């Protein structure tokens, strides 16, 4: 259709544009536009085109509107070749009919409601009133009043009317539907009595409010009766319109929308590019080749194994450029051992999380609902669940390996020579727990420390690469320069870590280590010296975060002592299962906390990443929140 000399649109990160542009040139494409800046020159546009487009928009919108009144909206699937005019035409009869039913249907509901409310008090008024509704010789005034209010209005009336009214009420509960009958002559005084009071007349909607009550009542009664049945019919028809028309609506929708995009596309490019990515034009010899591949860096719109699997997807995301310094990707293969490896549980902690994974590949029945995680049906976005199968793999793996460092843990919390712990007793493994014991514990703590060290190096090294390959001497020196300090830092720790080694051995070396630092920090000149203290907080942080990942972990395993070996009396094999009153609970409590746990790692990681150590999402900047990023 439109773009008769025919469009391809590619979209993306701003930096990639030249490389993208090159990929597009290769494909078989011709007449590549705009190519920096914008504003095509005899390949633009006219409102005629726009008008026709407007017609597609009208249909598009219309299909949605009608779909709306019914309820739901369509999904990307099968458009189909149409007349645009045809599409517009198509929409009209069906929509109007459905819309018509809708229009009646709300009106019916309202009718039903109103009628229901009014009929009974009005009936009460009518019953008192008869003979005198008619008369305008005499006048009668309906109003409803409640039974406290029965003295207050009665006083207002009494003052005006005296006794020249005879004053009537009929009950219907919640008050009595009331009449004053007065002479017609007395009418203002009577109405005024209501006015002083603030008591209100049962005037009702429409013609009905105005009426002789008895007669009015008949009509009102009829509405009450009629409306639910009427509603049923209309509702059936509407329901009927969904059942049949939902596919129809969709096909139209898909078409109309796509067309709307398609049309739009032509219009924006016509004028003025994607932005920083790239359009262009093909004769139909050029047209088949071009779309299919042209290397992932971009989004277009058309006219061992565990370790490979999400990473494989990160290989492409390596390839998106911006600079000669290396790009986002690393996070997923970097996380995994520790991620899993905070989880260091036992029979009742870690080792049952498989069941949950088995409820993501098998499911559950025993409470309300779940059916298939692959079909990800939900209380809050379904969609996501289908997408995050990449995550479903990593999670199934997370538990599996996590269970396993729990089982590493139960090597050292079973076996009778290693600790006092049973090899496999009459209660349960991991029984009178002892990794808590300070010396044993000390080792597990110190275990945590190491991963933090890795991170110190990994980040600053990447800074030196930043300036290396983005060429900034400023970045280079900054990333490199801090390492000048480091030998001396290692000295100071060591004098306590070995209690000896340095700090008075390599502390003479400290005297020279401190100067080396400030040399190239000084080469940039840098009044921006002070910061170096703050860097000192960070190292310790790695330790602490890991430390907690251990400690809170460890604590968790030691909580299964007070979960399942003991928690009232001392827990043997019956009071043990008097703890099982609590035991089921502890699983769900355990569930809550562990969501908490993982996020520290990533926070940790983010400290490094968004100090621009390998990552060009960071406080914005193309690429997008890391939250969204790593998951594929």
């Amino acid at each position: 259709m439109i773009a008769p000399m025919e469009k391809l649109v590619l979209a993306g990160p701003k930096g990639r544009a030249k490389e993208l542009l090159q990929s597009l040139q290769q494909a078989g494409v011709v007449h590549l536009e705009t190519l920096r800046p914008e504003a095509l020159s005899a390949y633009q546009l006219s409102p005629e085109e726009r008008a026709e487009l407007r017609r597609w928009e009208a249909v598009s919108a219309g299909a949605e509107h009608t779909l709306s009144l019914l309820g739901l909206e369509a999904e990307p699937a099968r458009p189909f070749p149409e007349g645009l005019e045809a599409a517009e035409k198509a929409l009209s009869p069906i929509q109007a009919h459905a819309e018509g039913l809708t229009r009646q249907k709300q009106e019916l509901e309202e009718e039903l409601a109103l009628a229901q409310a009014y009929l009974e008090p009005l009936e009460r008024l009518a019953a008192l009133a008869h003979g005198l509704d008619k008369s305008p010789f005499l006048r009668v005034i309906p109003f409803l009043l409640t039974e406290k209010e029965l003295p207050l209005v009665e006083e207002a009336l009494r003052k005006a009317l005296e006794d020249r009214y005879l004053l009537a009420h009929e009950a219907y509960a919640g008050g009595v539907a009331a009449l004053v009958v007065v002479h017609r002559k007395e009418v203002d005084q009577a109405k005024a009595a209501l006015s002083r009071a603030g008591v209100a007349e049962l005037r009702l909607p429409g013609a009905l409010g105005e009426l002789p009550l008895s007669e009015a009542a008949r009509r009102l009664k009829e509405r009450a009766e009629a409306a639910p049945r009427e509603l049923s019919e209309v509702r059936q028809h509407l329901a009927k319109l969904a059942r049949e028309s939902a596919s129809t609506l969709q096909s139209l929708w898909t078409r109309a929308q796509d067309e709307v995009a398609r049309l739009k596309a032509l219009e924006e490019l016509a004028s003025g590019r994607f932005g920083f990515a790239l359009l262009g034009y093909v004769p139909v010899k050029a047209k088949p080749k071009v779309e299919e591949a042209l290397a992932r860096h971009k989004e277009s719109v058309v006219y061992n194994p565990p370790w490979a699997k999400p990473f494989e997807l990160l290989v492409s995301f390596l390839n998106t450029p911006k600079y000669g310094t290396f790009d986002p990707t690393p996070v997923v293969p970097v996380f995994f051992p520790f991620w899993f490896g905070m989880i260091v549980g036992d029979i009742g902690y870690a080792l049952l999380f498989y069941l949950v994974g088995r409820w993501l590949s098998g499911y559950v029945k025993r409470n309300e609902p779940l059916v298939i995680d692959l079909f990800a049906l939900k209380l809050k976005p379904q969609v996501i669940g289908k997408l995050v199968h990449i995550l479903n793999w990593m999670v199934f793996w997370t538990v599996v390996w996590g269970v396993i460092y729990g089982e590493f843990f139960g090597t050292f919390l079973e076996h009778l020579g290693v600790f006092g712990t049973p090899e496999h007793p009459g209660l349960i493994p991991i029984l009178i727990h002892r990794i808590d014991t300070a010396k044993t514990a000390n080792l597990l703590i110190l275990l945590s420390v190491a991963f933090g060290v890795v991170l110190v190096f990994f980040g600053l090294a990447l800074r030196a690469y930043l300036g290396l390959k983005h060429r900034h001497m400023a970045h280079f020196w900054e990333g490199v320069g801090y390492l000048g300090g480091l030998v001396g830092v290692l000295a100071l720790a060591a004098s306590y870590l070995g209690n000896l080694q340095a700090g008075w051995l390599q502390g003479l070396m400290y005297l020279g280590f401190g100067v080396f630092l400030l040399a190239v920090l000084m080469s940039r000149i840098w009044l921006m010296i002070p910061e170096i203290f703050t860097q000192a907080g960070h190292i310790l942080s790695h330790i602490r975060i890991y430390a907690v990942g251990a400690a809170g972990g460890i604590l968790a395993g030691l909580l299964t002592d007070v979960g399942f070996a003991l928690a009232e009396r001392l827990g043997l094999l019956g009071v043990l299962l008097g703890l099982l009153v609590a035991g089921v609970l502890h699983l769900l409590i355990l569930l809550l906390t562990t969501l908490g746990h993982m996020l520290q790692p990533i926070r940790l990681l983010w400290v490094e990443f968004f100090t621009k150590f390998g990552f060009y999402e960071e406080n914005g900047r193309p690429y997008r929140p890391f939250k969204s990023v790593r998951e594929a």
Binding site: M5, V30, H31, P283
Partner: protein, 62 residues
């Protein structure tokens, strides 16, 4: 490039239609003149012929 080849050829086809029209606007003029002239000689052939026949008539009458 196949696009610009086509852009040339088209504009060039557009030229071909301008010329063809212009030619026709010349031809119609050419043919107008031709009729116009024919019609004029006719008017004077008629009259003179008559003015002859009658004149001589007056010669006879004398």
């Amino acid at each position: 490039s196949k696009l610009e080849a086509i852009l040339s050829q088209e504009v060039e086809a557009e030229i071909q239609a301008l010329l063809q029209e212009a030619e026709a606007k010349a031809e119609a003029v050419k043919r107008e003149a031709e009729e116009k002239a024919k019609a004029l000689l006719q008017a004077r052939e008629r009259a003179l012929e008559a003015q002859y026949r009658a004149a001589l008539r007056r010669a006879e009458s004398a």
